[PDB]
Amino acid sequence: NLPITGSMDTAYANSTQEETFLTSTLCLYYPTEAATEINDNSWKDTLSQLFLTKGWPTGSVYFKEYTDIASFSVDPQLYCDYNVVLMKYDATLQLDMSELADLILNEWLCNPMDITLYYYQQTDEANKWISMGSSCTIKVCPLNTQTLGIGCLTTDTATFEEVATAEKLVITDVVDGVNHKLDVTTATCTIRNCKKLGPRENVAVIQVGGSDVLDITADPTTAPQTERMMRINWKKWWQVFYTVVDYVNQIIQAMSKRSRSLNSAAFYYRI
Amino acid sequence: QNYGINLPITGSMDTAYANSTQEETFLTSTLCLYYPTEAATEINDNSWKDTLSQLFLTKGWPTGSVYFKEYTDIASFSVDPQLYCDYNVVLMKYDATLQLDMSELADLILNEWLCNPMDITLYYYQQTDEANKWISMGSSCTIKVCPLNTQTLGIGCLTTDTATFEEVATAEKLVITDVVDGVNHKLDVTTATCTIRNCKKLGPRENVAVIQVGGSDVLDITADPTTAPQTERMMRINWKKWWQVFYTVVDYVNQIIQAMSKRS
Amino acid sequence: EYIENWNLQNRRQRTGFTFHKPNIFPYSASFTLNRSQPAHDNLMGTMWLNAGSEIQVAGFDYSCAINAPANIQQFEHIVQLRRVLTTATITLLPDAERFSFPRVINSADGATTWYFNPVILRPNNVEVEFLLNGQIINTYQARFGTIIARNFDTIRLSFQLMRPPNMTPAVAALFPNAQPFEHHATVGLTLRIESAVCESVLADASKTMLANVTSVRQEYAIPVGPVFPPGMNWTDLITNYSPSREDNLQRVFTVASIRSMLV
Amino acid sequence: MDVLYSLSKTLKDARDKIVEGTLYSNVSDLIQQFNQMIITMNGNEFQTGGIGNLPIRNWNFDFGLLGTTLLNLDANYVETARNTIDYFVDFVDNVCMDEMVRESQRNGIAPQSDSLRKLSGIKFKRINFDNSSEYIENWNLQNRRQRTGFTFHKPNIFPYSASFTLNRSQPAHDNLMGTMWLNAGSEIQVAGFDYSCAINAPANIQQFEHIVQLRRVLTTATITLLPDAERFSFPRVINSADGATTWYFNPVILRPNNVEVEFLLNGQIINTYQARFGTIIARNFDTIRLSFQLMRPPNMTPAVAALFPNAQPFEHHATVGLTLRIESAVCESVLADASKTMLANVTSVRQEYAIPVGPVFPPGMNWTDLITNYSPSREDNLQRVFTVASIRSMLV
Ligand SMILES: *[C@@H]1O[C@H](CO)[C@@H](O)[C@H](O)[C@H]1NC(C)=O
Ligand SMILES: *[C@@H]1O[C@H](CO)[C@@H](O)[C@H](O)[C@H]1NC(C)=O
Ligand SMILES: [Ca+2]
Ligand SMILES: [Ca+2]
Ligand SMILES: [Ca+2]
Ligand SMILES: [Ca+2]
Ligand SMILES: [Ca+2]
Ligand SMILES: [Ca+2]
Ligand SMILES: [Ca+2]
Ligand SMILES: [Ca+2]
Ligand SMILES: [Cl-]
Ligand SMILES: [Zn+2]
Ligand SMILES: [Zn+2]
Ligand SMILES: [Zn+2]
């Protein structure tokens, strides 16, 4: 990182929207019921041709399908330069969808949490415990300097306080500066000590139907709706895809290139 | 003053404020309340329109000007809703299952539209820009579309076979269709029961205020996903009785009118 | 200087008065709306303060020139100086700090108040024209800081709101494709005449002739006469600066300088 | 230059003092000086003009002397004097214009027009008398290699520069730390902005620095320092440094903390003021260093606490501004300022006659370019043309 000095008299460059569309890829994530209702085996081709009418080259818009919010939340691997997740709304899953958004709208620096040998804690408000798997049931036993438990016995898990049950993804936030013994099913879950670095600008979440319920910040005093969190009312999925295609320029203007240099080596759909 | 986009109007930042014009506008303006049949059902009083007119008179309106129009429900009210009052207030009952229909109705009545007739049998139709929409109304509106290419052949559809078309509306009473711009579309609609119009959203409708009774903020009067604006004419209240809803509308009628602009 | 100009004017020779910050513009805080409607929510126009030796103008578009051709909204402002200025040093600054904060402004006829919520953008294609008798004398394109207007009686400021073709998400949010518009794109301009030369007498920031004459007239309760406005108010005087007013005012200014030699 | 100035001063004194009815005792010395000027100039041929659209003009001096026997001046005497005065004023105006439009790189202090070079001859020094104006006095001091001094009300020392430096930036430009400034004329507005309000800063303090280099040394400078920057306190959409994109700025103004202004000369601290606002005196400096701090308020009201969250998004960006206005200063070099007119006169003459761009000054006499690259050669040429412009302003 170096200082950048700019002149406020500098002339605006021409639109780069065409070039970024030509040199980037767009990944769309939708629920399988969308494909069920559309009932057309060539609809990927149709959406690709419509996106070509919108500027994107053929073969740059990738369509990815997930069963539901709960399943998609197990290690979501976002591939393209720009990712748009069409997330169905359910009044019963307000937390989970939020968690999913909280997982994909932010960058996370995660390290393994070997609970069975080590005692863990959360240093600051950015530190969370992100647990993903088939069934994440997490119980917590707060501890203290004398190494005893507060309303929990380290030798008896039945006394561990309950914070997650049968979860595909859950973010656990406990009181900072306190050591907690953890009881989670390592067989059906993996828990990681994570820090949210900041917003993840290459991922937009469009909530299909419903109202504003997403809360991507653990702080109760903030429920910020960034430009990348859209929400559309719906009755047909074809209308949903038509609006995603038509306002694609608007959607991408709300997004920015990831810019984060990762330690990982994952697969990407890139040109 | 009117709508002088054509010609300039110059003003001085020292011009003294006139007095309140609220009384004069109430005296020269007709007020209409659009409420669902359920409201009249829960209000067993038959002379209740008279009482509401009297209460408005206590609030300044002359006793020939406040009007009350009933509609069965949102679906039926969305069929060619005619608003002929200087100030229109639509009390719109909220239902979680009809969110898109609430949004379509509010978009239709909270905005001005320039609509031209459509002939889905005689011509193909495309949408020019983000303002060009298709607005279909009637008893039942089932609309299917086949996007064409530059060669007029269909994309993921066959023009001859309507079954291969893509379905954007079923049995609707009102629907706003927004397709990808610049692409000719062959259309199939139930013209017997569905009139479709090629419409352009000119701008907000300033004399119509929708009070959403109960519920939350679900109205999305913009086809752009990135924007869900809440204009000052889109109000929301929490309710258990319709008499209290009407009393709230009457008592804060000054606040409701100052949130709207008189008919031009 | 004043007696020299008096003698020169008696002989019909070219006079010259050097003014630091001449009070050449009568106070006028006004606005023009080129696009408007009774709700005052999608407004395009200009608002300006001409005061003394300062012009502060600002062109505002509520739609941010979304529908304007080429995404450019052209704003123009004209100030007709009541006397010709020569050898004028003028500061240009891109922004108008006076029209960059939210304000509630009366309607042209005073019936209602409208709302202004500026978000300031760099003025584009800035063009200052200094004209004399309807002919262009000096032209400055995209020039800021000190400029020289050698001889002019009219200032024509043409500027543009150019919608930025690229926007970051925070920026892209503020300017939606359609109404409602909550952040109105404003382009400013500030013009400051620091020093000029005029063949006529004027008030300015460094002298005391006007203040001396006004003080003497107020101290002895001089009734209003048929030449000068009541109280020797400079705005009225310069607004209707007639040759008869110019002669009387030069006389009293010369006498005031002669008095200042001693008092 | 001194001879041209003396001609102009003699002509101005003659205009002001040779008036109807005045005692000859009032003008006797002036009459002697005027007749001496006639004697010196008589029989001398000059040519002005011939550059740009400035017309070639030929000047011939064959004049009679003024009478000396009157007790009081009458109308006849004044008209007789005025004819010669008019011709001489025309000549001096044309010489001044011919000099104002010319420049040289190596020897720009020396006269450039043929007429002024001829007037630099020894025989013309008889015209020379009282050199009392500030510009001619500084010209004579510079010729004698003495310390020079020009007083400027609001010196135009800072070239126009509206720029920003981002010390923390992202492609989405939403967690931005840096500063933006306008230097223009005698004004410097600076504003440091932190989008996170220094929540992650070590001691909740963000340090901002702004160094401005003056192209000439200023002395005896009265400056006003104010703790806010109105220029960077309203929302704006600003281009990016490359111009590719635009970012958003939504200031909320906090008072600057630990304000420290240093006036430096050759990198040495001459004057220093901490937490001092209003009028300060910088006695001798060439650099201004403004250091200020954004201190996160330890205690906040609910509205203030709502403005500044723990993490992103950041919608209200904390800003601390400083304003520095030089009202009066002294410089050893000529500078444009707000009260004088020499620059405007030189530019006006160069424009009215369509003078081609020369090898010294920037096109159009643009002050920003001149002061940005204020080289010694440019300073010499500028002092020459400014002295000539003042001499011209004595008459025209
Ligand atoms: C920018 O757009 C203009 C307008 O057509 C075009 O002439 C120009 O070549 C484009 N590119 C650049 C780099 O200016
Ligand atoms: C406005 O109100 C004032 C204050 O009572 C009253 O005197 C006046 O007549 C009213 N009407 C007008 C036109 O000013
Ligand atoms: Ca969960
Ligand atoms: Ca327990
Ligand atoms: Ca915690
Ligand atoms: Ca929260
Ligand atoms: Ca519908
Ligand atoms: Ca098909
Ligand atoms: Ca469309
Ligand atoms: Ca929308
Ligand atoms: Cl000043
Ligand atoms: Zn108006
Ligand atoms: Zn001053
Ligand atoms: Zn940048």
Side-chain angles (χ1 to χ4, degrees), chain B residues 128-140:
Chain B
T128 58
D129 60 79
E130 61 102 44
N132 198 177
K133 301 279 173 282
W134 301 334
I135 306 196
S136 90
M137 236 165 271
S139 313
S140 75

PDB file of all heavy atoms in Angstrom, chain B residues 128-140:
ATOM      1  N   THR B 128     -37.820  -0.038 -24.670  1.00  0.00           N
ATOM      2  CA  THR B 128     -36.748   0.856 -25.094  1.00  0.00           C
ATOM      3  C   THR B 128     -35.701   1.033 -24.001  1.00  0.00           C
ATOM      4  O   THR B 128     -34.500   0.891 -24.254  1.00  0.00           O
ATOM      5  CB  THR B 128     -37.328   2.209 -25.507  1.00  0.00           C
ATOM      6  OG1 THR B 128     -38.049   2.783 -24.412  1.00  0.00           O
ATOM      7  CG2 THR B 128     -38.259   2.047 -26.693  1.00  0.00           C
ATOM      8  N   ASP B 129     -36.133   1.323 -22.778  1.00  0.00           N
ATOM      9  CA  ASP B 129     -35.208   1.655 -21.702  1.00  0.00           C
ATOM     10  C   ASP B 129     -35.844   1.273 -20.372  1.00  0.00           C
ATOM     11  O   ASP B 129     -36.924   0.679 -20.326  1.00  0.00           O
ATOM     12  CB  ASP B 129     -34.841   3.143 -21.757  1.00  0.00           C
ATOM     13  CG  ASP B 129     -36.048   4.045 -21.604  1.00  0.00           C
ATOM     14  OD1 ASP B 129     -36.504   4.240 -20.461  1.00  0.00           O
ATOM     15  OD2 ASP B 129     -36.543   4.558 -22.628  1.00  0.00           O
ATOM     16  N   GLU B 130     -35.177   1.649 -19.280  1.00  0.00           N
ATOM     17  CA  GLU B 130     -35.596   1.259 -17.940  1.00  0.00           C
ATOM     18  C   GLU B 130     -36.957   1.816 -17.555  1.00  0.00           C
ATOM     19  O   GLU B 130     -37.522   1.371 -16.550  1.00  0.00           O
ATOM     20  CB  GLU B 130     -34.555   1.716 -16.920  1.00  0.00           C
ATOM     21  CG  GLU B 130     -34.344   3.226 -16.891  1.00  0.00           C
ATOM     22  CD  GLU B 130     -35.038   3.894 -15.722  1.00  0.00           C
ATOM     23  OE1 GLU B 130     -34.964   3.362 -14.594  1.00  0.00           O
ATOM     24  OE2 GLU B 130     -35.667   4.949 -15.934  1.00  0.00           O
ATOM     25  N   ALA B 131     -37.476   2.796 -18.287  1.00  0.00           N
ATOM     26  CA  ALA B 131     -38.811   3.312 -18.019  1.00  0.00           C
ATOM     27  C   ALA B 131     -39.896   2.584 -18.798  1.00  0.00           C
ATOM     28  O   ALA B 131     -41.062   2.629 -18.398  1.00  0.00           O
ATOM     29  CB  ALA B 131     -38.875   4.806 -18.348  1.00  0.00           C
ATOM     30  N   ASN B 132     -39.542   1.920 -19.893  1.00  0.00           N
ATOM     31  CA  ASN B 132     -40.524   1.252 -20.735  1.00  0.00           C
ATOM     32  C   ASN B 132     -40.897  -0.084 -20.104  1.00  0.00           C
ATOM     33  O   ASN B 132     -40.041  -0.960 -19.941  1.00  0.00           O
ATOM     34  CB  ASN B 132     -39.960   1.054 -22.141  1.00  0.00           C
ATOM     35  CG  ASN B 132     -41.032   0.775 -23.198  1.00  0.00           C
ATOM     36  OD1 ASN B 132     -40.707   0.648 -24.377  1.00  0.00           O
ATOM     37  ND2 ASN B 132     -42.296   0.677 -22.794  1.00  0.00           N
ATOM     38  N   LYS B 133     -42.165  -0.227 -19.731  1.00  0.00           N
ATOM     39  CA  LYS B 133     -42.697  -1.436 -19.125  1.00  0.00           C
ATOM     40  C   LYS B 133     -43.950  -1.853 -19.881  1.00  0.00           C
ATOM     41  O   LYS B 133     -44.471  -1.114 -20.720  1.00  0.00           O
ATOM     42  CB  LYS B 133     -43.027  -1.220 -17.642  1.00  0.00           C
ATOM     43  CG  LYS B 133     -41.847  -0.792 -16.801  1.00  0.00           C
ATOM     44  CD  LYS B 133     -40.989  -1.972 -16.417  1.00  0.00           C
ATOM     45  CE  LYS B 133     -39.715  -1.527 -15.715  1.00  0.00           C
ATOM     46  NZ  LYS B 133     -38.697  -1.023 -16.682  1.00  0.00           N
ATOM     47  N   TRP B 134     -44.437  -3.052 -19.583  1.00  0.00           N
ATOM     48  CA  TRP B 134     -45.732  -3.505 -20.073  1.00  0.00           C
ATOM     49  C   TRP B 134     -46.666  -3.629 -18.883  1.00  0.00           C
ATOM     50  O   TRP B 134     -46.333  -4.292 -17.904  1.00  0.00           O
ATOM     51  CB  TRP B 134     -45.604  -4.838 -20.809  1.00  0.00           C
ATOM     52  CG  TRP B 134     -44.686  -4.777 -21.988  1.00  0.00           C
ATOM     53  CD1 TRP B 134     -44.382  -3.678 -22.734  1.00  0.00           C
ATOM     54  CD2 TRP B 134     -43.952  -5.862 -22.561  1.00  0.00           C
ATOM     55  NE1 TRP B 134     -43.506  -4.009 -23.735  1.00  0.00           N
ATOM     56  CE2 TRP B 134     -43.224  -5.346 -23.651  1.00  0.00           C
ATOM     57  CE3 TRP B 134     -43.838  -7.221 -22.260  1.00  0.00           C
ATOM     58  CZ2 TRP B 134     -42.399  -6.140 -24.438  1.00  0.00           C
ATOM     59  CZ3 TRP B 134     -43.013  -8.004 -23.042  1.00  0.00           C
ATOM     60  CH2 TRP B 134     -42.313  -7.464 -24.120  1.00  0.00           C
ATOM     61  N   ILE B 135     -47.812  -2.964 -18.943  1.00  0.00           N
ATOM     62  CA  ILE B 135     -48.782  -2.992 -17.855  1.00  0.00           C
ATOM     63  C   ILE B 135     -50.028  -3.692 -18.375  1.00  0.00           C
ATOM     64  O   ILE B 135     -50.665  -3.217 -19.321  1.00  0.00           O
ATOM     65  CB  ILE B 135     -49.095  -1.579 -17.339  1.00  0.00           C
ATOM     66  CG1 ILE B 135     -47.781  -0.878 -16.958  1.00  0.00           C
ATOM     67  CG2 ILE B 135     -50.079  -1.639 -16.166  1.00  0.00           C
ATOM     68  CD1 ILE B 135     -47.921   0.356 -16.078  1.00  0.00           C
ATOM     69  N   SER B 136     -50.365  -4.828 -17.773  1.00  0.00           N
ATOM     70  CA  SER B 136     -51.498  -5.631 -18.212  1.00  0.00           C
ATOM     71  C   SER B 136     -52.535  -5.668 -17.103  1.00  0.00           C
ATOM     72  O   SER B 136     -52.197  -5.891 -15.937  1.00  0.00           O
ATOM     73  CB  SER B 136     -51.064  -7.045 -18.587  1.00  0.00           C
ATOM     74  OG  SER B 136     -51.127  -7.897 -17.468  1.00  0.00           O
ATOM     75  N   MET B 137     -53.790  -5.452 -17.480  1.00  0.00           N
ATOM     76  CA  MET B 137     -54.904  -5.336 -16.554  1.00  0.00           C
ATOM     77  C   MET B 137     -56.047  -6.206 -17.056  1.00  0.00           C
ATOM     78  O   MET B 137     -56.059  -6.631 -18.210  1.00  0.00           O
ATOM     79  CB  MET B 137     -55.367  -3.881 -16.442  1.00  0.00           C
ATOM     80  CG  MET B 137     -55.372  -3.321 -15.045  1.00  0.00           C
ATOM     81  SD  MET B 137     -55.507  -1.521 -15.056  1.00  0.00           S
ATOM     82  CE  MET B 137     -53.785  -1.046 -15.134  1.00  0.00           C
ATOM     83  N   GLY B 138     -57.006  -6.481 -16.181  1.00  0.00           N
ATOM     84  CA  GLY B 138     -58.229  -7.144 -16.576  1.00  0.00           C
ATOM     85  C   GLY B 138     -58.616  -8.231 -15.597  1.00  0.00           C
ATOM     86  O   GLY B 138     -58.024  -8.379 -14.531  1.00  0.00           O
ATOM     87  N   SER B 139     -59.633  -9.007 -15.989  1.00  0.00           N
ATOM     88  CA  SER B 139     -60.187 -10.029 -15.104  1.00  0.00           C
ATOM     89  C   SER B 139     -59.138 -11.070 -14.742  1.00  0.00           C
ATOM     90  O   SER B 139     -58.923 -11.374 -13.563  1.00  0.00           O
ATOM     91  CB  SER B 139     -61.385 -10.699 -15.775  1.00  0.00           C
ATOM     92  OG  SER B 139     -62.263  -9.742 -16.335  1.00  0.00           O
ATOM     93  N   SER B 140     -58.486 -11.639 -15.750  1.00  0.00           N
ATOM     94  CA  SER B 140     -57.385 -12.573 -15.552  1.00  0.00           C
ATOM     95  C   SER B 140     -56.346 -12.267 -16.614  1.00  0.00           C
ATOM     96  O   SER B 140     -56.664 -12.251 -17.806  1.00  0.00           O
ATOM     97  CB  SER B 140     -57.849 -14.029 -15.654  1.00  0.00           C
ATOM     98  OG  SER B 140     -58.095 -14.399 -17.001  1.00  0.00           O
TER      99      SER B 140
END
